[PDB]
RNA sequence: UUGACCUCAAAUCAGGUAGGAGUACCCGCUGAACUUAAGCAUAUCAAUAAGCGGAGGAAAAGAAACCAACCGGGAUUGCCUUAGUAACGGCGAGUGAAGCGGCAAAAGCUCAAAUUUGAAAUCUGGUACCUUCGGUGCCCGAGUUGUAAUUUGGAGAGGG
RNA sequence: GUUCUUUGUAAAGUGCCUUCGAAGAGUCGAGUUGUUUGGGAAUGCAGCUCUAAGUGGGUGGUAAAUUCCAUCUAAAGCUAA
RNA sequence: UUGACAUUGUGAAGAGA
Ligand SMILES: NC[C@@H]1O[C@H](O[C@H]2[C@@H](O)[C@H](O[C@@H]3[C@@H](O)[C@H](N)C[C@H](N)[C@H]3O[C@H]3O[C@H](CO)[C@@H](O)[C@H](O)[C@H]3N)O[C@@H]2CO)[C@H](N)[C@@H](O)[C@@H]1O
């Protein structure tokens with residue numbers, strides 16, 4: 006609010022906080038991003054390197070969701086199993102009745118390889134899993150099932 | 154026309170004066186191919202009095 | 212100008228934007244009046260529930276194809292499969308969509324089921340005004356909700372057939388890439404006929 | 406049904422036949438008024454196709470228009486502005502002569518309603534058009550239920566507002582990705598995406 | 609066609625019990641259509657050939673056919689919409705010699 | 708000699724209609740420069756101001772020559788988000804939408820091209836007569852260079 | 868909620884066989900010019916020039932030839948919220 | 949101002965690589 010603002014502190018002092026020599030003018034240096042290649046060069050390199058020019062390849066009519074692959078890790082995994090059942094399924098450690106985790110229906114659809122998991126087995130229903138992810142699921146005695 | 158296409162008529166009378174002339178000119182080439190004998194006649198309005206109206210064409 | 216270390220912004224306000232500016236102060240009254248506009252429809256519309264029955268439809272692309280969605284209308288196959296005509300299916304309130312053909316059975320089943328099951332819970336008044344007093348249900352879609360087809364079961368046995376699920380996608384995509392390269396080297400192999 | 410013959414006939418215009426009909430009539434059009442009454446459609450099939458019927462209260466008018474680039478009505482050729490707006494000569498109207506025709510004849514009969522129009526003839530100086538007007542005052546059209554929507558004041562001078570077949574063309578109204586600009590209506594759709602929407606609880 | 613049920617691949621997709629819809633009338637807008645096919649063929653020779661159609665066939669039965677496809681693509685303003693006119697001329701060329 | 712026809716005229720012919728105002732919003736046309744780029748010409752301002760034609764209570768848009776490429780979706784409009792993104796850009800200053808998804812509201816449709824051909828089944832007016840947003844009978848007119856029914860692609864028609 | 872009239876020597880719905888199924892041009896499309904667009908070998912718009920087809924046609928956001936695939940049916944029309 | 953294309957139809961001779 007205004008009563009907190011420093012411009013109430015400056016009432017009575019000539020020139021607000023703006024200085025006697027340099028004042029506060031309209032647009033010294035020019036409006037906006039003007040002169041980035043010239044008098045603002047030093048600021049565009051240093052804090053925005055790469056800002057000028059082109060790099061790489063264009064894409065016409067690019068629509069995201071051609072690319073949709075929300076990423077999930079063994080780092081979590083078991084979160085996708087509700088809390089209480091998660092206990093008894095960990096207790097089971099069965100190759101006979103083993104919990105099914107459908108990643109795509111869980112908001113996901115690529116499974117990555119970060120972090121350790123228990124020896125308890127998992128049926129991983131997914132699409133697009135990473136090489137190291139799977140192999141770590143084999144350490145738990147479990148499989149991955151590709152779907153769409 | 155539908156008759157001449159279906160071969161259900163014998164004598165056709167096509168008047169000389171019709172604007173547009175496209176309303177007709179295809180018939181003498183059509184009435185021959187469909188084997189219906191036809192006659193180009195005077196009196197677009199003469200053929201009409203035959204049929205109770207002011208004008209006729211076919 | 213340009214100073215300190217700050218992200219570059221893009222603020223499109225050079226255009227007389229202060230001309231075309233919409234506050235919504237009416238969000239209150241555009242609701243209070245959005246309600247009263249619905250309230251007296253159902254009044255004027257009498258026991259009928261404000262909306263048509265709407266189908267169950269899969270929804271598109273690679274992102275939202277997982278879920279299932281209410282479509283526009285029931286299409287044609289399902290309407291006769293529900294035992295009634297299009298022209299009547301709109302008189303009993305139901306959504307008829309003449310486009311959107313049926314390429315999927317599991318949906319086509321559930322949808323025709325959704326129709327008869329609708330025809331069940333209704334009561335369709337006669338020509339006359341002598342009718343059983345008609346307590347009015349306002350909702351329809353929430354009276355006939357749409358579940359999510361259950362797919363799998365809760366637990367199973369590990370079936371490991373010895374495949375690398377990763378290596379599949381490698382070989383599934385490698386297959387996609389080289390088709391036209393392997394059809395052409397067979398195309399040049401059939402030219403070995405001298 | 407004789408109509409489809411004329412419809413396929415006319416579809417061969419550079420035919421040895423129609424060039425005669427073309428030349429003969431196009432001269433007859435010039436001798437007459439720029440805007441004049443035609444007591445019956447040159448094309449009975451095309452007018453048909455667009456909703457012309459032979460009942461009382463339908464009217465057909467024929468008109469000439471002046472064919473080609475619009476010149477800046479700028480006095481010396483002097484633009485008085487930046488070099489991009491300097492242009493005078495090679496400049497194209499954003500509407501078609503057909504639409505220019507509908508408007509000028511829609512003005513002559515101020516009591517009728519423009520329904521549609523079709524091309525008939527052209528030479529270097531003129532394109533020639535016949536325009537279908539529907540008398541909204543005439544009882545035959547008022548009591549005919551497949552028409553009398555034109556008696557609705559909504560449709561007053563639908564040619565000026567670009568609500569005819571040509572209008573929506575030039576106005577650009579079509580579904581699809583190519584019509585994004587001016588499908589919902591141009592300025593409407595501009596002003597829309599140029600609006601700042603501020604709610605009570607800001608987002 | 610037949611969906612491999614895999615995340616990605618050549619035919620990749622989801623496996624669903626495969627129905628098939630009854631075709632739509634709309635889908636045939638080509639419409640052989642007896643009345644049309646006969647009415648146009650009648651008209652076709654009443655008005656005769658047109659100044660470009662004429663010198664188009666003069667090109668074919670004189671030097672070149674590929675030559676006549678050049679002018680065909682130019683005059684009608686497309687490639688695969690030319691050949692339909694070009695080959696059509698080879699039909700009209702059979703109105704003469706081989707009956 | 709007499710009678711129609713096409714076309715085209717006239718009347719203080721019988722009945723009507725258009726104009727002008729308003730302009731916040733709405734459909735189009737036409738169309739800037741100040742300005743920004745620390746100069747300036749492309750660019751920006753802006754598909755804006757000014758000028759012009761046409762409406763309604765809303766206008767417009769609309770039952771797809773759509774979107775997608777999915778297990779597909781399904782008239783249009785608007786909100787939310789896509790997104791300051793894809794892309795455009797002395798690739799500089801700057802500009803910049805769309806498909807999906809949630810919600811508001813939801814509504815679908817008709818002509819043209821078909822022989823009633825064992826019957827113009829259609830219609831405007833005039834007129835008396837009444838029960839007068841009109842109804843019947845009679846009569847002139849329209850109309851076969853096509854008025855009615857029937858059909859609109861989701862079909863559908865003829866037959867059986 | 869009243870009691871009439873009798874609309875029906877009309878109209879609509881639905882089953883099955885076989886045949887047929889007309890669907891819009893100086894248009895679509897193209898070239899070029901201008902303009903416009905985020906639309907980039909060209910987003911729309913218009914001028915002139917060329918000018919289609921009917922298992923055809925349009926779209927599929929990198930131009931072309933070739934081969935397929937997907938999806939809609941232009942160039943006529945009405946409609947509340 | 950010059951060329952082209954279109955308005956643009958009907959004929960005849962006698963000449964060009
Ligand atoms: N960045 C976009 C959005 O900006 C918003 O910005 C909010 C704040 O950052 C902003 O605060 C500004 C402050 O930025 C600025 N440097 C100083 C100023 N006094 C503040 O403004 C504040 O105080 C004034 C004075 O009473 C009030 O009138 C104003 O409503 C209030 N927001 O007020 C904004 C709301 O009006 C929020 N950060 C957030 O919703 C989002 O980031």
Ligand SMILES: NC[C@@H]1O[C@H](O[C@H]2[C@@H](O)[C@H](O[C@@H]3[C@@H](O)[C@H](N)C[C@H](N)[C@H]3O[C@H]3O[C@H](CO)[C@@H](O)[C@H](O)[C@H]3N)O[C@@H]2CO)[C@H](N)[C@@H](O)[C@@H]1O
Pocket residue numbers: 608
């Ligand atoms: N994207 C949709 C829009 O998001 C807006 O919200 C934006 C901002 O409010 C929010 O910005 C917050 C800022 O509020 C807060 N005070 C500081 C915070 N660091 C900012 O976040 C920012 O930095 C973080 C971390 O680096 C990143 O997520 C990202 O670069 C950016 N959002 O980040 C949001 C990114 O969009 C508004 N809610 C609204 O206009 C609209 O929903």
Ligand SMILES: NC[C@@H]1O[C@H](O[C@H]2[C@@H](O)[C@H](O[C@@H]3[C@@H](O)[C@H](N)C[C@H](N)[C@H]3O[C@H]3O[C@H](CO)[C@@H](O)[C@H](O)[C@H]3N)O[C@@H]2CO)[C@H](N)[C@@H](O)[C@@H]1O
Pocket residue numbers: 857
């Ligand atoms: N082609 C065989 C079948 O023909 C059917 O033909 C339709 C009509 O031709 C058929 O005739 C109906 C009849 O059902 C109903 N009970 C009596 C009614 N008068 C008839 O109606 C019809 O016939 C009259 C002539 O009588 C015509 O004016 C016109 O074709 C139509 N109105 O009734 C069908 C209703 O759909 C359908 N097109 C379809 O079931 C199927 O194609």
Ligand SMILES: [Mg+2]
Pocket residue numbers: 008009013
């Ligand atoms: Mg203080």
Ligand SMILES: [Mg+2]
Pocket residue numbers: 013014015016017018
């Ligand atoms: Mg002080």
Ligand SMILES: [Mg+2]
Pocket residue numbers: 017018
């Ligand atoms: Mg002091």
Ligand SMILES: [Mg+2]
Pocket residue numbers: 018019020021022
């Ligand atoms: Mg001081």
Ligand SMILES: [Mg+2]
Pocket residue numbers: 019
């Ligand atoms: Mg002082």
Ligand SMILES: [Mg+2]
Pocket residue numbers: 022023
């Ligand atoms: Mg200070």
Ligand SMILES: [Mg+2]
Pocket residue numbers: 020024025028
């Ligand atoms: Mg000072």
Ligand SMILES: [Mg+2]
Pocket residue numbers: 026027028029
């Ligand atoms: Mg200073």
Ligand SMILES: [Mg+2]
Pocket residue numbers: 056057058798
């Ligand atoms: Mg840059």
Ligand SMILES: [Mg+2]
Pocket residue numbers: 261262
């Ligand atoms: Mg609702």
Ligand SMILES: [Mg+2]
Pocket residue numbers: 435436437438
């Ligand atoms: Mg004169």
Ligand SMILES: [Mg+2]
Pocket residue numbers: 461462
């Ligand atoms: Mg008349």
Ligand SMILES: [Mg+2]
Pocket residue numbers: 484
């Ligand atoms: Mg000027």
Ligand SMILES: [Mg+2]
Pocket residue numbers: 484485486487490739
């Ligand atoms: Mg100027």
